Write a protein that binds this ligand. Structure first.
Ligand SMILES: Cc1ccc(O)cc1
Ligand SMILES: Cc1ccc(O)cc1
Lengths: 347, 344
């Protein structure tokens, strides 16, 4: 069924997009003057899960939580248990993503794809293991484990669609997870680990050299194949990154838009688009994160985010922050008046 | 009274800002990790009208509408009557700013500061004249007219604080008004007209040279003094631009935030900050407009917008689009949970 999911991602509706362009050109403004709001509306109009038009019903941010073996290499400043503490706080509404999702009218789904702690009540259990393998010394997981989790998360995602969610955001929580994110970005883009490794959650600058070394070691011991995104995810990714890629595949299969977040989400999007290029028209950037490897990842996705907030929290917080932008494109398209009704016509 | 208003603009509250920063650093996140949302929350905390804390109550976008004598010089591609048509469409809720304001939960106040038409019922009447003077041949208005309109608009704006408004946005409507906007930007920044004259509302590129010529003419003829922002507005501005400056002065007098829009609003902000430097801490950029002079104007304001939408509609549309960012800063500050746990 993974083969089938990938094969059956629909093409966007080019004919609806052309009708959308013509409609937007007739709205009460100089043609082209709403810029990327116009192109965002046309992008939405082509998503087959919507109604031929930009549309926003219910909104969901899917936050993928897991721990990482590579935390053992000293690449993170916070204690391991913070992943579990933060997942529990997600159920209480006290995290950055919760507060911003609430403001945007979106629901947060907290998904445990492999936290190294006891199960947390209120969290969706999709737990592959208690943390993934330490990527510096071997693979994060087996190929079968990565494929199974991709299918489970894609299915959970498209079930939300059947329930009326029309806009997704993706996020994550996982101490040390900027390490595998950087390894994937290096592998997919061909960039040296040094160009894409940053401070993550306030790693002291003195410790960056060790982190670059770890990323290189992970890449060397595993030999991830850039032509096989599932190989890359399984080898030098993690459960959270696989789960994020699964939300993108699910939403695409369902013909629905998904907002990216920051660097972790850019790395998962590089995997998803290598796995299935048909995913790409469904992705919407939110913000340009303040993480070192952001520019390179975004360049490889040919993405220009809407928001420049110097944000680096993760969790889906930037995706939630951008939800009103998607709603604004819809509001423009459906609620603006038209040039012809005011008899405004130029030669 | 305009002198008194300017003198009485409060300083931002350093103590409140220090308390806000300390609170933000203790939230459930790595320090600094919410970036400019943090800095915005602190900027808000300092504004005395907000009573010590980032908060947002009611929201209002003030859209300043007027016609321009310089339309006669061939600098605009729409008929002059489009100003009046659009101001009336604003009362009906069908314009870009209306639809985006409604999405943001804000009210649009449409204010006629000098449309060349009969008054439009349902539009706020602060009309100076039926269009301003053609800046290509003389001044837009007298100094007294500019000063009177600044005071009137500033008073209207701060009076909105009584109805619970805590967050303003500014906008305009006025065919040809990107011509005076470029003239003012040229004067304040020292840039040649060619560097700051754009297409406006889709002016054909073959008509750009003429627009550049008109801007230079206007400056040559009027000799605006860049160190006297009221002189610049009155000479090579327009009633809409003066109105926009007045909203900023009134918000600052009230100790309250105002979101800018695009190039017209940057031009009015440069005027406002020259008139009263104390205005500056109250201004919040929205988007980086897709207008030629934007980068220069924003550089002179030391401003880096949050949104990169290639937008160039004006009307306050970008200000409205940014209001949820201000609300996000307030939500972070008041609703997030709070944290020697770090590894050596
Ligand atoms: C049709 C039109 C023209 C200019 C403008 O600012 C808005 C609408
Ligand atoms: C305390 C903390 C650390 C990391 C993180 O992503 C969130 C909160």
């Amino acid at each position: 069924t993974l083969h089938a999911l990938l094969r059956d991602i629909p093409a966007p509706d080019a004919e609806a997009m052309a009708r959308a362009q013509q409609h937007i050109d007739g709205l009460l403004k100089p043609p082209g003057s709403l810029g990327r709001l116009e192109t965002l509306a046309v992008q939405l109009a082509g998503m087959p899960g919507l109604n031929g038009t930009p549309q926003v019903g219910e909104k969901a941010v899917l936050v993928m939580c897991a721990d990482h073996g590579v935390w053992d290499e000293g690449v993170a400043v916070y204690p391991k248990i913070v992943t579990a503490i933060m997942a529990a706080n997600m159920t209480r509404g006290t995290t950055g993503v919760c507060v911003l999702a609430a403001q945007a009218g979106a629901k947060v789904h907290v998904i445990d794809v492999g936290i190294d702690a006891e199960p947390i009540p209120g969290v969706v259990n999709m737990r592959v293991a208690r943390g993934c393998g330490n990527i510096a010394v071997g693979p994060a997981m087996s190929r079968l484990q990565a494929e199974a989790l991709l299918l489970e998360v894609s299915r959970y995602t498209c079930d939300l669609a059947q329930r009326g969610v029309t806009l997704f955001g993706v996020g994550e929580m996982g101490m040390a997870n900027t390490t595998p994110a950087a390894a994937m970005v290096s592998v997919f883009t061909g960039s040296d680990a040094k160009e894409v490794v940053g401070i993550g959650a306030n790693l002291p600058p003195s410790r960056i050299d060790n982190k670059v070394d770890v990323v290189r070691r992970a890449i060397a011991i595993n030999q991830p194949n850039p032509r096989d995104g599932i190989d890359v995810l399984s080898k030098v990714g993690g459960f959270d990154l696989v789960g994020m890629t699964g939300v993108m595949l699910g939403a695409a299969r369902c013909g629905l838009p998904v907002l990216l977040d920051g660097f972790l989400s850019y790395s998962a999007a590089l995997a998803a688009c290598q796995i299935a290029p048909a995913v790409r028209p469904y992705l919407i950037p939110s913000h340009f994160s303040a993480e070192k490897g952001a520019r390179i990842a975004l360049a490889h996705l040919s993405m220009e985010p809407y928001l420049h907030m110097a944000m680096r929290l993760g969790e889906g917080s930037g995706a939630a922050l951008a939800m009103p932008i998607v709603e604004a494109a819809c509001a423009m398209f459906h609620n603006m008046g038209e040039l012809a009704a005011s008899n405004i016509v130029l030669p």
